Ligand binder design. Structure first.
Ligand SMILES: [Cl-]
Ligand code: NA
Ligand code: NA
Length: 153
């Protein structure tokens, strides 16, 4: 079910966004996408998994925030081959400075949302407002991003 919570105790003129994105550290070339995908599918459905071995990292997005929380706890520090897979909260939406890297929760002043950010929030298939306007004092899950700005599809 979509998160759309009244969260009136957060700071004025802001929204709270729960990340669905996990940062993956320790990603040596012995750590491959099909294997990580199978590991994370235990916790829920995986929406995106992109490894960049050039940087020894990857980014995972779960369809559901609750699945991301379960995955982050279970996969926080996993010995594997020549490395240790280290799963931490990432940020996939909004200003990076607004994201608490300890918890994967952003509190974002509405004034810092770009027009693309605003549009993605209200039109996202997963996360976001579920088609409602952005107003202060609401908590939401990370929306899907990086698609065209449109309301016809
Ligand atoms: Cl799921
Ligand atoms: Na590393
Ligand atoms: Na570390």
């Amino acid at each position: 079910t979509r998160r759309f919570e009244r969260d009136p105790t957060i700071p004025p003129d802001s929204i709270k966004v729960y990340s669905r994105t996990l940062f993956l550290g320790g990603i040596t070339r012995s750590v491959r996408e099909p294997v990580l995908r199978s590991m994370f599918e235990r916790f829920g459905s995986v929406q995106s998994l992109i490894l960049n071995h050039n940087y020894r990292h990857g980014f995972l997005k779960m369809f559901r925030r609750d699945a991301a929380e379960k995955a982050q706890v279970a996969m926080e520090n996993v010995p594997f081959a020549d490395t240790t897979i280290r799963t931490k909260w990432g940020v996939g939406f909004g200003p990076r400075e607004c994201s608490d890297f300890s918890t994967g929760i952003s509190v974002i002043p509405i004034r810092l949302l770009t027009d693309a950010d605003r549009t993605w929030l209200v039109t996202a298939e997963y996360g976001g407002t579920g088609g409602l306007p952005i107003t202060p004092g609401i908590a939401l899950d990370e929306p899907d991003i990086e698609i065209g700005l449109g309301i016809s599809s």
